[PDB]
Structures are given as structure tokens and as C-alpha cells.
């Protein structure tokens, strides 16, 4: 059964630090504790080791990514720009 | 700009009523 209506993972903080701060922390906590699909082996086994470091449980590759997300929008855009310049 | 201002007046009154009831 759904134990918490809206607080979710941030329920560890109880009634502290303010609703807005807890809401802002919820997104990043979920992102940093989620599993991501590894671009190398293709399996959803990428997990955060430390801030910026992501380990693949299967292929054992260590990637430098975001603090709380596997990849960042700015990094994606930079990669796209480099690829486009390579193509043309 | 005649009934729209009545709406604005009523909204102000409702805001005051909310503040008072709170």
C-alpha cells in the first residue's frame, strides 16, 4: 500500500526543514538514488557511488556524471554540438 | 470595465474575509 501520499523518500526528515525545502530535496534525492540505463552494456545498473561518480554493476564501468543525475542537460548539449561539428 | 471592477472588488472582499476567518 502507498505509505506516504506525497512526501515519498523525503519522509525520513519527518516534519523538519520546511515543506518547500523538503520538496526541493525530494527531486534530487530520487534522482540520485535511482538506477540508470548504462550506455555501454545497456542494462539498468548505473548507481551513484559518490557525487559525480557512477558505477555500472554489470560491466564495472565508472563514469563521470552529474552530482544527482547520471547525465546533465548541459553535457548532453555539448556532446550534441561536438557530434554535429564532427559530422559537418 | 464595469462588472470586471465589481469582480475585483468582490475578490478583494473575499481575500479580506479569508484573512479574518483564518
Amino acid at each position: 500500500a502507498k505509505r506516504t501520499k506525497k512526501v515519498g523518500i523525503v519522509g525520513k526528515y519527518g516534519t523538519r526543514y520546511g515543506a518547500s525545502l523538503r520538496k526541493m530535496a525530494k527531486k534530487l534525492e530520487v534522482a540520485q538514488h535511482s538506477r540508470y540505463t548504462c550506455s555501454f552494456c545497456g542494462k539498468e545498473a548505473m548507481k551513484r557511488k559518490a557525487t559525480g561518480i557512477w558505477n555500472c554493476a554489470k560491466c564495472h564501468k565508472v563514469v563521470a556524471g552529474g552530482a544527482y543525475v547520471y547525465g546533465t542537460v548541459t553535457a548532453a548539449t555539448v556532446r550534441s554540438t561536438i557530434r554535429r561539428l564532427r559530422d559537418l | 470595465m464595469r462588472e470586471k471592477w465589481r469582480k475585483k472588488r468582490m475578490r478583494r472582499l473575499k481575500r479580506k474575509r479569508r484573512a479574518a476567518k483564518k
Partner: protein, 96 residues
């Protein structure tokens, strides 16, 4: 592109195939692998090994336009396939 998916579906429905690296290597060694389809995210060393085996066996290698997830989906499986070998095209024109 869109044609290879249809040919692969026809091969799965009617043809004969082996899904996976080890079976692909065995089929290449014993010379019944008509074609070898290989995903785009396969490890580079494995890619080179498959290509070397194919060059030895005089068989075609097709670099699928997708990762192992998409290759498995094309094969119609709910798991990931990073390599496969078609040994009998069946009622399909995959080889040509």
C-alpha cells in the same frame, strides 16, 4: 533500415537463427552462419572478434542501427541480444 527489421521478423517467424555470442561463434566455426547481425553498442573487442571470425568464414556482418535492447526487440525477445547469426533465411530475403 526499416526493411532489415521486416526481414529479421520474417527470419524469426520462418528461418533458423542463434541468438547470442557463444552460439554465434560456434555457428561461425562450424560454417552454417549465413549472416551475422551485431548490435551497435557491443564491446569493441567483441566487435573485432566477430568481424575476424566472419572474415575467416566468408560471411556477411551487418551492424544493426541500434543497441542490444533494440536488437532484442527486433528479434521479438524480452531480453537483450548483442549478437545473432541467421543460419537459414527461410522465407525471407535477408541474405540478399
Amino acid at each position: 533500415a526499416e526493411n532489415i527489421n521486416s526481414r529479421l521478423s520474417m527470419v524469426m517467424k520462418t528461418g533458423q537463427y542463434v541468438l547470442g555470442y557463444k552460439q554465434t561463434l560456434k555457428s561461425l566455426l562450424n560454417g552454417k552462419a549465413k549472416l551475422v547481425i551485431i548490435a551497435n553498442n557491443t564491446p569493441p573487442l567483441r566487435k573485432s572478434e566477430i568481424e575476424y571470425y566472419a572474415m575467416l568464414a566468408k560471411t556477411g556482418v551487418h551492424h544493426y542501427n541500434g543497441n542490444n535492447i533494440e536488437l532484442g526487440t527486433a528479434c521479438g525477445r524480452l531480453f537483450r541480444v548483442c549478437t545473432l547469426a541467421v543460419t537459414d533465411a527461410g522465407d525471407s530475403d535477408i541474405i540478399l
